[PDB]
Amino acid sequence: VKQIGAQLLPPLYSLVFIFGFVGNMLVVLILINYKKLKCLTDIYLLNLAISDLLFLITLPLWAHSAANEWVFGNAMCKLFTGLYHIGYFGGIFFIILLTIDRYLAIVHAVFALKARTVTFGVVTSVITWLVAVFASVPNIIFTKCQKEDSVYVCGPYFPRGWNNFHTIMRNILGLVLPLLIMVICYSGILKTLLRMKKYTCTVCGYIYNPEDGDPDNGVNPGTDFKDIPDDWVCPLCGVGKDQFEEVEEEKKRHRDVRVIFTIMIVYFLFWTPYNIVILLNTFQEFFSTSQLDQATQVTETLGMTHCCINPIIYAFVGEEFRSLFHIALG
Ligand SMILES: CO[C@@H]1COCC[C@@H]1[NH2+][C@@H]1CC[C@@](C(=O)N2CCc3ncc(C(F)(F)F)cc3C2)(C(C)C)C1
Ligand SMILES: [Zn+2]
Numbered sequence: 001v002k003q004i005g006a007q008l009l010p011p012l013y014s015l016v017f018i019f020g021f022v023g024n025m026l027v028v029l030i031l032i033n034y035k036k037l038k039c040l041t042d043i044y045l046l047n048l049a050i051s052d053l054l055f056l057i058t059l060p061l062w063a064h065s066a067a068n069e070w071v072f073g074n075a076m077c078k079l080f081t082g083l084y085h086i087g088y089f090g091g092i093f094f095i096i097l098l099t100i101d102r103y104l105a106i107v108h109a110v111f112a113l114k115a116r117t118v119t120f121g122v123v124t125s126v127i128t129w130l131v132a133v134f135a136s137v138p139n140i141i142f143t144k145c146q147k148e149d150s151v152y153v154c155g156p157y158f159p160r161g162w163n164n165f166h167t168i169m170r171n172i173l174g175l176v177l178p179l180l181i182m183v184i185c186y187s188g189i190l191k192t193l194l195r196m197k198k199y200t201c202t203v204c205g206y207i208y209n210p211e212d213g214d215p216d217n218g219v220n221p222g223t224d225f226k227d228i229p230d231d232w233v234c235p236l237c238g239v240g241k242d243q244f245e246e247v248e249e250e251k252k253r254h255r256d257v258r259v260i261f262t263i264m265i266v267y268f269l270f271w272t273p274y275n276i277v278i279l280l281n282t283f284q285e286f287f288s289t290s291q292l293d294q295a296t297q298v299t300e301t302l303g304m305t306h307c308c309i310n311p312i313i314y315a316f317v318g319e320e321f322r323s324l325f326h327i328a329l330g
Contacts, residue, residue, distance in 0.1 A: 001294050006067040009301065013063035016308045020056040023311030024049045034324060040112045041101055041256070043121035047128070048094040048263075048310065055087025056307040070152040074145040077154035081143040085136035086129075087307075092174050093128045095267060096181050098260045103185040105253060107192050135173060138162055167282040175275045182264055189257055198247040199225045204236040207247065252319075259318045266313060270306035274299040 027049040035042050058080045061072060070077065104110040112120055142158045158166060199208045208214070213221035216235055219228060225244070232241060249255050277299050281292040315321045 001297065005297070009066035010063045012301070013059045013066070013304070016305050017056055017059040017063070020052065020059075020308030020311075023308060024052045024056065027311050027314060028053070030320070030324065035320075038117070040117050040121050041098060041253075043118070043125060044094050044097045044101060047125050048091060048098070051087050051091035051094055051132075052307045052310050053087075054083050055091065058083045058087070059304070059307075062304070065154065070145055070154045072145075072154075077145040078140050078143060081154070082136050082140045085139045086132050089135040089173065090129060090132040092178055092267065092271075093132055094125075095260070095264055096178055097124070097128065099181055099185045099264060102253075102257055102260055103189060106257070107185075107188045135169070138166060164282060167278050171275050171279055174271060178264065178267070186257075186261060186264075193249075193254065193257070194226070195222075195224050197225065197249075199244045200247045201234050201236070201239060202243050202245055203239050204234065206234055206236045208244070255319065259314065262313050262317045263310065266309055267306065270309070271303045274303045 028046060031037060031042050031046045031049070037043055037046060061076070061080050065072075072080075138158075139156070142162060143154065143156050145152060145154050146157065147153070148155075156163075196210055198210070200206070201208075208225060210222060210224065213219050213223055214235060215221065217232065219232070228241070230241060233239065234244075274296070277292060277295045280287065281296055284292075
């Protein structure tokens with residue numbers, strides 16, 4: 001495990017820092033220059049890129065210290081632990097705000113006034129950074145630079161009280177809160193999208209509008225396509241219900257749900273294994289102890305590579321890159 005750490009992490013963390021810094025800085029430049037931070041969602045996307053930047057700028061010191069002793073001092077050990085937790089806790093909170101922003105705008109039809117868009121986004125973002133700072137305060141206090149087995153190490157030294165409280169709070173803030181928000185928000189968004197979703201016929205091209213409906217053949221307005229009976233047929237050509245296909249939303253705010261939903265799902269796939277093993281390692285209910293100790297180190301690496309995956313999601317899943325690529329040519 002110690003030799004695997006000296007071999008695997010230095011080149012891995014170097015590649016994550018190169019791909020991560022260039023990618024996340026491009027997101028910041030595209031939000032400031034192309035989008036101009038006009039919408040409310042753009043301010044939280046900018047803070048999410050800053051959350052990743054603050055996190056990934058600590059990788060050169062972790063990459064270096066994976067193969068040799070800690071030589072930056074106790075002051076840098078405390079500072080770089082703060083940037084890790086502010087970047088980690090900060091990031092997950094801005095993903096929750098982007099999910100809440102979409103839930104209220106799609107499910108409840110709420111909108112920020114043009115004059116109060118920049119004012120609301122700035123005040124709530126400062127409050128989020130303050131809550132992310134207070135969540136990192138315990139980790140900055142107890143993480144120190146001490147010597148263990150004649151080797152200088154920058155690691156956590158929490159008493160049994162604050163260590164148990166650290167573990168449960170990291171799970172509540174990084175695993176229970178985002179997952180509890182995911183199930184309530186995205187289901188509610190899926191419910192309202194399904195009712196308003198339009199369906200196009202593959203034969204004649206007849207686009208079924210739910211707001212208008214089809215009063216002619218006994219379909220009152222505002223009815224869902226899934227709620228229409230099986231014996232129903234197309235008004236133009238009279239084809240069957242099985243030939244009708246789905247239509248993508250014309251509104252970019254409705255198509256943007258897939259971008260933020262992926263960001264949330266990818267966060268869980270990378271950070272849940274770490275959050276679960278620290279809970280199993282701290283609260284040894286039935287627990288073999290060496291397996292949980294090595295598993296905490298392996299799952300931490302996975303979580304630390306997550307910083308460079310956010311710009312890759314906006315490139316492939318998001319249409320904001322393909323639109324910018326067409327503008328860059330003609
Ligand atoms: C100062 O603490 C930091 C801020 O506060 C939270 C904890 C965080 N811990 C740091 C994060 C960098 C760190 C690390 O990433 N490690 C440990 C050693 C290790 N050894 C082998 C493998 C292996 F086998 F899986 F490859 C993985 C790993 C994972 C280390 C390189 C300095 C420990
Ligand atoms: Zn038809």
